[PDB]
Design a protein around this ligand. Structure first.
Ligand SMILES: [Cl-]
Ligand code: NA
Ligand code: NA
Ligand code: NA
Ligand code: NA
Ligand code: NA
Length: 129
C-alpha cells in the first residue's frame, strides 16, 4: 500500500508514535517519506547482504528474520515479510524498539540526513488529526 501523507500521519498517531521517546509525529512521517516514499512494500538490499523492509526500512541484520542474513539477529521477533503489510502495526511496534535502543532516530540514515534539523512539522501541516 502507498500511503498518503496525512493518512500515514493519522495511522502513526493512532499507534502511539506522536512524541514517542520525544520524537514529534512529523519526524516519523519525514523518515517514512525518504525511506520508502510511503510504500509498505519497499525493499532494498544492503552491501553486507542484509535487506531493509517496509515503510521504515527496518534492517534484517538486527531486527527481523528473512532466512537469508547469516549471523543476524531478530530483535523484533518477526519475519521481515510482516513489515510489508498494509497494516503498519508490526513496523510501528518494531520501530518503537529501535528508537529506544540508545541512538534515537539516528538509526535511520535518511532521517539523520534529510529530516534532522529541518521543519519537520511541515510534514503534518494541513492534516486532520
Ligand atoms: Cl541519506
Ligand atoms: Na498492499
Ligand atoms: Na511534528
Ligand atoms: Na536493492
Ligand atoms: Na535477521
Ligand atoms: Na495501518
Amino acid at each position: 500500500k502507498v500511503f498518503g501523507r496525512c493518512e500515514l500521519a493519522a495511522a502513526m498517531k493512532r499507534h502511539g508514535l506522536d512524541n514517542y521517546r520525544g520524537y514529534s509525529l512529523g519526524n516519523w512521517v519525514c523518515a517514512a517519506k525518504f525511506e520508502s516514499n510511503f510504500n509498505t512494500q519497499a525493499t532494498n538490499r544492503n552491501t553486507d547482504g542484509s535487506t531493509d523492509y517496509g515503510i521504515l526500512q527496518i534492517n534484517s541484520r538486527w531486527w527481523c528474520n528473512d532466512g537469508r542474513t547469516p549471523g543476524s539477529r531478530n530483535l523484533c521477533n518477526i519475519p521481515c515479510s510482516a513489515l510489508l503489510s498494509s497494516d503498519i502495526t508490526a513496523s510501528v511496534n518494531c520501530a518503537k524498539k529501535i528508537v529506544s535502543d540508545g541512538n534515537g532516530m539516528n538509526a535511520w540514515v535518511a532521517w539523520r540526513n534529510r529530516c534532522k534539523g529541518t521543519d519537520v512539522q511541515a510534514w503534518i501541516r494541513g492534516c486532520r488529526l
